[PDB]
Amino acid sequence: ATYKIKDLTGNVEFECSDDTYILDAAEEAGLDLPYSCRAGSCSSCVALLISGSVDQRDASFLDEEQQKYFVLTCAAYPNSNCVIKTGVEEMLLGYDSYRDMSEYLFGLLGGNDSPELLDGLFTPVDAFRHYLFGNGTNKSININDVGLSIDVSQIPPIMNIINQGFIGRFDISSDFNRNTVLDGIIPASYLGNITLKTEGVLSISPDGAWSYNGGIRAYNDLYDANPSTHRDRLGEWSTGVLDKFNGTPYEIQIPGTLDISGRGQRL
Amino acid sequence: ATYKIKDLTGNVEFECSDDTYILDAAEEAGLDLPYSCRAGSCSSCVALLISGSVDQRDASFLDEEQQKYFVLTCAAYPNSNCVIKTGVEEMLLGYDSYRDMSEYLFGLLGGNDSPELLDGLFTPVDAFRHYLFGNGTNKSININDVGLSIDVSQIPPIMNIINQGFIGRFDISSDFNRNTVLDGIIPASYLGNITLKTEGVLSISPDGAWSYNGGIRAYNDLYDANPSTHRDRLGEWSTGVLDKFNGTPYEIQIPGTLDISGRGQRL
Amino acid sequence: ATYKIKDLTGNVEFECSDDTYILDAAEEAGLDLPYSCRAGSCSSCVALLISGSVDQRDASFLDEEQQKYFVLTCAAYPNSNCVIKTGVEEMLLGYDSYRDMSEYLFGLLGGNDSPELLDGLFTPVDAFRHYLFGNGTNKSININDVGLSIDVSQIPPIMNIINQGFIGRFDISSDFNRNTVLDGIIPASYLGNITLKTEGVLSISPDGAWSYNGGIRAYNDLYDANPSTHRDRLGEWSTGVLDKFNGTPYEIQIPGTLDISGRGQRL
Amino acid sequence: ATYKIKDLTGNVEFECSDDTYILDAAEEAGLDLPYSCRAGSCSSCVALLISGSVDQRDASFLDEEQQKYFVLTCAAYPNSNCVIKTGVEEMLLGYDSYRDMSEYLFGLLGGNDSPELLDGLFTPVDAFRHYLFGNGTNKSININDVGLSIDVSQIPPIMNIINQGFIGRFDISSDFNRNTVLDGIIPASYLGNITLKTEGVLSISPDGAWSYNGGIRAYNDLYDANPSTHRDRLGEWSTGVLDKFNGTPYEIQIPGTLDISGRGQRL
Ligand SMILES: O=S([O-])[O-]
Ligand SMILES: O=S([O-])[O-]
Ligand code: FES
Ligand code: FES
Ligand code: FES
Ligand code: FES
Ligand SMILES: [Cl-]
Ligand SMILES: [Cl-]
Ligand SMILES: [Mg+2]
Ligand SMILES: [Mg+2]
Ligand SMILES: [Mg+2]
Ligand SMILES: [Mg+2]
Ligand code: NA
Ligand code: NA
Ligand code: NA
Ligand code: NA
Ligand code: NA
Ligand code: NA
Ligand code: NA
Ligand code: NA
């Protein structure tokens, strides 16, 4: 019947019955896959065939060997659920053996895992491992799982209003920097400084009593610390590793909203 | 509510309700976990809280930020599935920060991965990565998913019978070695030589016509290749990785039965 | 060893070592369970043994069959963690079988569940089901989750001051009625009219500019509507239900504080 | 991280990630839901937000007031586990009050309880209440918590071998029926007859001494007794409750393995 296709390029999954070409099913789901011709006679749509059976008798550009490892998405019907990696044109031309592509494949594992970072004590070293071997695919951790303890008095753009003596009702919509050292050793060992945004209402009475009610969201944070920072957060064993292995920066998505409330009395 | 508790100390999983102290449940399952005071007031039962949430109000002494990274198995109620590492009294007694334990945690990162190996082009590199990060924990792959293509003619303890000229009905129960180079590049790139066992009935008629009906099962395969073998299977990149990061041997369980039938004519 | 005892009367928990009678351990932690003889010689201290194991060889009043379901707290040592329901002296005095205490035990389930009301569109019917089967135990919902949208113009004790032409600074501390129809159909469908309290400061300048800044808390609300009101709120089916099944009133606790502020100009 | 979305239209329950729209996550699960646009524009996606919180900022159609009760599922992220009902669109007319849905929602209130049955004296009445309000969702209790006391003499497929006079070593793999009246009043009051399976080795020496070693597992049990059985197990009160509120059969999962040993002498 219908089989699921996972494209490791961007970690997207789309349905495809056994009478639809893989490329058309992808476009049907709004996906912009590569193609030049559309008749099984070039390599513009070539994808790695990581796992699954495909019927590509319509394919003519790949021979018998390449068909064991690659698939023309415009000319192939699925026979099972499939994993593919689109956009690997340079690979097909230079392909020699499994051996010669195994390092590239080992590098795809990080992106094929769940994007969600491991929790607890694993989160910072999971982040560092993905830096070493993940080749830039995004990871994620909900803002509610990061372990932040944000007090209103730690939010400069709100305290900026309070401390200038203003009185009244203020619609807050501000970015601010959060040094997660204030929050705990776990977030401080892979996130460091992060950019947050708060939206809400600050009320300040004639006599300086204030309240704030709103939410906090987080921008994606770029994991690209230098070795000196890795040494501060993880220790000099990280420096010995980075002396031999280069990291690849990637984004940590931090979805969700953190509710925030606070009250105080000025001066 | 019961939850899953893995102790990467010996990689054992046991059941524990939200009313059971983790030390008691593990003692139920006959496990030998460290303890001394059994009263929430010493460092002998302390495990790392690598993942999960717990109820440690009877713990008392932790109290500090310590409670987010340590758990007292004699006085803790599981509020979730938990990865824990017993035997860390030394880290509790003298950790300054995450810096001191990050390298230990890093090497343990695959210790709670699912056992099933990835399929297809991923299987050999998945097996290699688990060698580096798996903490010696089991992987598995069904014998029907390995990609084995065995003819009876490649089974010596059966062919040894046919070629001696015997005539009759043989109950076969024989181990034999299988070099999966014969089966394909994928199994050859992480299994190499495996030991199989076949059980069945071999019939040889007076005129030399023969047939065999049976099954094939596989013993657990130790993944422990030396650097030369990895260099052959994967290439020279594997050597730099293995030098810096250490491999821990683990077993690949190959459950299931593979059916086999064959027939021929001796002369 | 030392164990935990949970008395379903109030859902109170306390410790009890294996060499302390349940009753004594309860008093040593501030509780006040019934007793008279304190010598295993009546039913003043009897409790249902929901679960757990006790040594009550000192318990004369209970025969072996009764000791499967009941425990004399002055005569029993905990062998394990225990859930009990004290004060059930009559239950025993009429006991004959599990069958004959099952309706009573069913009526304890509502009190045993979490006291927080379900959310959203389940809140009004969760409240009605607890009315039917909860036998009077408290429920709760945080004032912030009720769905109140209160404007100072809806608070008569504040508006009465402004509307009389007064000028100055008023310390406010007043109860007032909140018809939660003003707030939304969910609160209107189980809370109806509730009593709130506000404390804060009303300042009215000579030119009639005014502002109010304070907080709002909620008294416990007694859920005790008559069938006419249930029919208004839930529909005719509730009258069919109430024609065969009686409710028991219970209090809904509404903890927390809401921030309130308002501004206006009298002319 | 990832939340359970439960849709009342099919009693279906499917995961949805914090960064994924509810409709997309439903499409990936195997579900078919209504969709006309996908920019928050129409109402074909609209669902009733029964329980939980969503982020609907991308959505444009619904007013701030309708967002309290309605969710555009192609444009909404879950903030929490959610209960919705898809296949709604007419209700936006404003011709359905809370009164019109209240009886429906009341009847499935137990449908999101955790699956583990309560222990001890509560188990039978917990099972009965789930029959009334659980909407057919599963419950569970570990076989080791049920209170079974099975002796090998009560296992007919083992005694059958012993009693025919056989001598040797036998692999046992046999279903058999257990009337839990044999085990205790609690299991007899909600499980009744259950089907179990035992796997193990029975050895019988020439002199008729026998030993059995193995384990026992339980099949899922359907809770669907008729009003007569409920009266016998709980009493007359259960019939009036059952008449008014009605039962929905559901399965009780009984996981785990119960170890069993027997020793005897055939003589
Ligand atoms: O600005 S927020 O959506 O990250
Ligand atoms: O843990 S690393 O330094 O091999
Ligand atoms: S686009 Fe040319 S082969 Fe598919
Ligand atoms: S054994 Fe001492 S704290 Fe647990
Ligand atoms: S007080 Fe009399 S039996 Fe306990
Ligand atoms: S399909 Fe139109 S808003 Fe969802
Ligand atoms: Cl995969
Ligand atoms: Cl309060
Ligand atoms: Mg950062
Ligand atoms: Mg091998
Ligand atoms: Mg009221
Ligand atoms: Mg049954
Ligand atoms: Na959000
Ligand atoms: Na929050
Ligand atoms: Na439990
Ligand atoms: Na080396
Ligand atoms: Na106002
Ligand atoms: Na329950
Ligand atoms: Na058998
Ligand atoms: Na009903």
Residue numbers in the entry:
A (entry chain C), B (entry chain B), C (entry chain D), D (entry chain A): 2 to 268
Quoted passage from the original study:
Pectocin M1 (PM1), the bacteriocin from phytopathogenic Pectobacterium carotovorum which causes soft rot disease, has a unique ferredoxin domain that allows it to use FusA of the plant ferredoxin uptake system.
To probe the structure‐based mechanism of PM1 uptake, we determined the X‐ray structure of full‐length PM1, containing an N‐terminal ferredoxin and C‐terminal catalytic domain connected by helical linker, at 2.04 Å resolution. Based on published FusA structure and NMR data for PM1 ferredoxin domain titrated with FusA, we modeled docking of the ferredoxin domain with FusA. Combining the docking models with the X‐ray structures of PM1 and FusA enables us to propose the mechanism by which PM1 undergoes dynamic domain rearrangement to translocate across the target cell outer membrane.
